[PDB]
């Protein structure tokens with residue numbers, strides 16, 4: 017299916033562009049960081065206009081009007097308010113920085129365990145079975161394009177945990193036993209690709225009196241016809 | 246089967262900074278305005294916390310696109326899940342075990358509490374969907390469509406995933422189902438008798454209750470004023486003197502809120518980290534199978550089942 | 564509508580949304596409509612007055628402010644006759660019904676047209692704001708927005724509770740009242756107020772003032788606090 | 798908390814007059830200037846009225862149909878602007894209901910795939 021896969025991949029990327037080019041909210045996680053920091057600074061600057069109990073928020077207006085014995089009192093009121101304002105700002109920046117650091121740590125983890133490797137961790141690198149990922153830069157952040165394998169179409173098959181041959185219980189080495197209503201096949205779990213059940217597909221352990229739901233079939237031995245002819 | 250308990254959320258408190266500092270007082274409010282945005286930026290910080298509390302809940306539980314439900318016939322290969330599946334006879338369709346969890350974990354000063362967006366009933370529906378998915382379709386519902394599979398076969402895959410050949414399961418299916426069923430009964434006996442079992446969630450409730458009680462008690466402090474009661478200052482002093490006494494209370498009460506909010510932001514970060522962990526486990530524990538050691542309990546992980554709890558999630562790791 | 568907004572102070576601002584509390588005419592409030600066809604009563608001044616008039620022939624030429632307006636107290640008189648604006652604050656003897664045909668402490672001498680004014684008294688200072696603009700409307704006040712600049716500030720020290728207008732007889736006018744509302748004023752790049760939000764007009768306006776913006780993004784915002792008021796004291 | 802009346806010696810409880818936060822629920826102003834108002838944690842007494850556990854919601858129409866959550870109110874209730882258009886309130890949907898056709902001998906195996 018290489019042509020199909022390449023075409024689906026190429027189409028999926030085109031869809032990414034259409035989404036990013038039209039949905040502003042797509043980058044809300046990065047835009048929000050910018051907005052929170054802008055708001056923090058605007059708040060800090062606006063606090064300079066506050067009196068905090070002083071006759072004026074403007075320091076030069078206090079100094080140009082009062083002698084030191086009185087000016088110092090009015091100034092101390094502004095210093096306390098403005099010093100308190102910075103402490104509030106810095107505390108918020110430290111807490112916010114911790115949030116960003118945690119995100120950066122996550123991003124670094126994904127880069128290593130998503131871009132440089134292949135993730136067996138579920139929904140770590142997008143919904144579906146992770147194949148590969150590609151990083152893209154963004155303002156103050158990283159964007160990952162996660163390429164995943166998603167089952168698309170399915171059929172209802174009858175199944176069994178094991179098959180009886182000569183009284184021996186045969187289990188799949190890989191895959192499951194399936195039935196289309198008339199014939200039993202063995203196939204890989206994540207993609208329907210029925211194969212004849214043979215001794216090279218299954219293994220034997222125990223017998224038919226133990227396994228619950230074991231069914232009768234035949235298991236083909238590839239050696240027989242070579243010795244038979 | 247082991248039980249791992251994680252906090253997901255914290256009470257969405259909200260404090261009216263003006264009413265807290267200057268409750269029903271015009272004279273005090275006008276003085277408070279001289280502090281600029283000091284009041285409203287605290288209202289903002291607490292709102293930010295309240296909002297992420299719904300985000301935390303949503304990221305942990307709403308990981309399934311559809312609400313799955315088990316069949317009326319519980320033919321799960323001998324595995325009894327009746328104590329983790331929803332009970333139809335209750336006013337809220339929670340499982341027996343969830344009820345146990347909910348039964349163990351337990352003003353006018355501008356302090357109010359906002360409800361969560363997702364009610365306990367909605368959380369129960371999500372854990373039900375995740376559980377029904379886990380039981381009837383294994384991990385396929387996580388990746389894409391929920392693809393039905395006999396439970397015993399699902400377990401066979403879970404066994405191959407830990408390096409044990411699938412014939413072991415089938416040959417010992419009765420033993421395995423019996424051990425599983427017994428293990429769940431043990432979970433109930435532990436949760437029903439050990440109050441400390443839910444200490445991680447009870448502690449969150451206690452820390453938040455303590456933070457609010459501390460904040461309210463601070464209103465009784467004078468902070469250098471002649472009285473902690475604002476009305477007693479105003480009813481006794483003319484403005485030129487009342488304003489001085491009030492400024493002393495405003496500074497103390499404004500400082501008290503700032504202390505409270507800072508502690509809530511730091512505590513919220515701790516809860517967020519826990520919620521992120523819980524969300525990670527849900528995806529890499531309930532929806533899948535973990536190859537990560539001691540990530541989903543001690544031993545070789547097979548499968549896990551979520552259960553809701555007050556402000557948190559409880560995982561039963563098999 | 565949105566009339567009755569004036570520059571609150573003498574500071575230049577530009578490209579900014581500024582929140583201020585002052586005596587403004589509340590948005591979409593009722594203003595009494597008087598006529599001058601084929602109507603110069605004494606009106607209350609309350610806490611300040613918004614005045615507006617529409618002209619085609621300059622009929623409205625003046626104002627009287629005071630308590631009794633009968634030579635018993637000082638009363639501010641403003642008259643504009645041809646090209647000369649006259650302001651006096653004498654204990655004038657006014658007619659039983661003052662009109663103009665076609666112990667003084669101060670004296671000064673200098674539809675198609677809408678002339679808006681604001682008259683307010685703060686600590687004895689009579690503050691006058693105004694704006695003249697061309698119009699093409701006879702029936703009523705034109706809808707739209709225009710801010711009024713200050714022109715005059717008279718330290719008269721007169722207790723004003725009532726006022727009356729002066730008409731030229733051979734032009735409708737409106738009287739509104741100001742309230743201590745908070746407004747968000749939008750200054751454009753030239754420092755001109757081009758829009759405004761009355762923060763107590765409705766919940767949406769409250770939201771706009773809270774967020775300091777004339778645009779509100781989709782969502783739920785906490786803007787205020789509901790409080791039941793007492794009816795009587797015990 | 799309470800006082801003894803100085804003229805007649807009986808005890809009166811003092812309960813502060815009803816109050817609560819007020820939130821405005823709005824579609825962006827680039828869509829509509831219609832809003833709904835939520836009075837937080839109050840009854841629809843002291844304040845097209847819908848009583849929720851989040852408070853008294855006024856101006857939003859209560860709709861029986863669930864939808865995906867848009868502007869959250871709380872306690873399972875979300876609001877949105879829909880049809881002629883107005884603000885509506887509803888209990889949010891948690892997703893479509895989909896039973897799995899489970900049986901002890903039936904397996905669904907994908908026959909095709911998509912790369913996303």
Ligand SMILES: *[C@@H]1O[C@H](CO)[C@@H](O[C@@H]2O[C@H](CO)[C@@H](O)[C@H](O)[C@H]2NC(C)=O)[C@H](O)[C@H]1NC(C)=O
Nearest residue numbers: 173174194195196197198199200201210211212
């Ligand atoms: C199950 O699969 C088998 C094998 O493909 C189907 O059997 C074949 O049917 C075709 C006709 O479509 C015949 O030409 C082949 O000779 C048959 N092969 C054998 C080995 O008998 C069978 O019909 C399928 N069953 C169902 C219910 O679809």
Ligand SMILES: *[C@@H]1O[C@H](CO)[C@@H](O[C@@H]2O[C@H](CO)[C@@H](O)[C@H](O)[C@H]2NC(C)=O)[C@H](O)[C@H]1NC(C)=O
Nearest residue numbers: 179180181182183184224225229230231232233
């Ligand atoms: C699978 O095939 C075996 C034979 O290979 C069946 O065994 C029979 O079981 C019945 C019931 O006890 C006995 O009466 C017969 O004598 C057994 N036959 C032989 C040859 O021993 C078995 O029942 C089959 N199972 C299914 C589900 O069809």
Ligand SMILES: *[C@@H]1O[C@H](CO)[C@@H](O[C@@H]2O[C@H](CO)[C@@H](O)[C@H](O)[C@H]2NC(C)=O)[C@H](O)[C@H]1NC(C)=O
Nearest residue numbers: 319320321323324325326327328341426429430
């Ligand atoms: C799953 O286990 C429960 C017990 O937790 C079983 O329910 C009990 O059934 C017996 C009868 O056999 C009653 O006497 C008990 O009172 C029931 N207890 C409860 C709590 O319901 C249930 O039948 C088992 N289910 C399966 C399929 O084995």
Ligand SMILES: *[C@@H]1O[C@H](CO)[C@@H](O[C@@H]2O[C@H](CO)[C@@H](O)[C@H](O)[C@H]2NC(C)=O)[C@H](O)[C@H]1NC(C)=O
Nearest residue numbers: 629630631632636686687720721722723724725
């Ligand atoms: C301005 O003048 C008015 C009267 O024109 C004064 O109002 C009176 O106030 C007294 C109390 O001091 C009341 O008993 C009268 O009934 C009021 N009169 C009216 C008509 O309401 C007003 O107090 C004066 N302002 C100042 C600052 O002195």
Ligand SMILES: *[C@@H]1O[C@H](CO)[C@@H](O[C@@H]2O[C@H](CO)[C@@H](O)[C@H](O)[C@H]2NC(C)=O)[C@H](O)[C@H]1NC(C)=O
Nearest residue numbers: 019020021023024027168169908909910911912
């Ligand atoms: C798997 O699904 C793809 C589509 O996602 C199928 O490819 C399409 O086949 C139809 C004809 O039936 C064409 O009209 C489309 O243009 C094809 N799309 C693409 C992207 O190639 C594919 O045939 C299916 N495979 C199987 C085995 O069923």
Ligand SMILES: *[C@@H]1O[C@H](CO)[C@@H](O)[C@H](O)[C@H]1NC(C)=O
Nearest residue numbers: 169170171172897898899905
């Ligand atoms: C499998 O059978 C169920 C029976 O309820 C049906 O609803 C479902 O669509 C079937 N699946 C397929 C892929 O045909």
Ligand SMILES: *[C@@H]1O[C@H](CO)[C@@H](O)[C@H](O)[C@H]1NC(C)=O
Nearest residue numbers: 228229230320322900901902
């Ligand atoms: C599967 O379920 C059917 C009932 O629908 C029952 O008769 C049959 O014996 C069961 N088989 C197994 C292996 O449990």
Ligand SMILES: *[C@@H]1O[C@H](CO)[C@@H](O)[C@H](O)[C@H]1NC(C)=O
Nearest residue numbers: 589590591592593594595764
């Ligand atoms: C304005 O006057 C109209 C009557 O013409 C009345 O219905 C309306 O309620 C009044 N509005 C205000 C704010 O006074």
Ligand SMILES: *[C@@H]1O[C@H](CO)[C@@H](O)[C@H](O)[C@H]1NC(C)=O
Nearest residue numbers: 642643644645646647648649
């Ligand atoms: C305007 O009135 C004044 C008296 O107050 C008078 O002296 C003057 O002549 C009048 N008009 C003009 C155009 O001069």
Ligand SMILES: *[C@@H]1O[C@H](CO)[C@@H](O)[C@H](O)[C@H]1NC(C)=O
Nearest residue numbers: 634635636637654655666667
């Ligand atoms: C001017 O004011 C004085 C009070 O100082 C008063 O006695 C006098 O009668 C006033 N003049 C007139 C003309 O009323």
Ligand SMILES: *[C@@H]1O[C@H](CO)[C@@H](O)[C@H](O)[C@H]1NC(C)=O
Nearest residue numbers: 578750751752753754755757
């Ligand atoms: C400022 O005034 C100039 C005229 O000198 C005009 O061209 C320009 O558009 C004005 N700016 C705004 C924002 O109205």
Ligand SMILES: *[C@@H]1O[C@H](CO)[C@@H](O)[C@H](O)[C@H]1NC(C)=O
Nearest residue numbers: 800801802803804805806807
């Ligand atoms: C108040 O008046 C009543 C009579 O109506 C009397 O009985 C009571 O003792 C008085 N209270 C006080 C405190 O004097």
Ligand SMILES: *[C@@H]1O[C@H](CO)[C@@H](O)[C@H](O)[C@H]1NC(C)=O
Nearest residue numbers: 038040778825826827828829
């Ligand atoms: C928002 O309104 C402006 C008009 O000021 C319009 O040009 C723009 O396309 C609108 N955008 C949306 C998303 O409705």
Ligand SMILES: *[C@@H]1O[C@H](CO)[C@@H](O)[C@H](O)[C@H]1NC(C)=O
Nearest residue numbers: 839840841842848849850852
């Ligand atoms: C509102 O008051 C009524 C009684 O009139 C009561 O039945 C109802 O439960 C109250 N609702 C809330 C939300 O308090």
Ligand SMILES: *[C@@H]1O[C@H](CO)[C@@H](O)[C@H](O)[C@H]1NC(C)=O
Nearest residue numbers: 847858859860861862886887
């Ligand atoms: C919901 O439907 C019921 C009828 O089953 C009706 O009585 C009720 O008024 C409806 N509610 C709304 C909000 O439409």
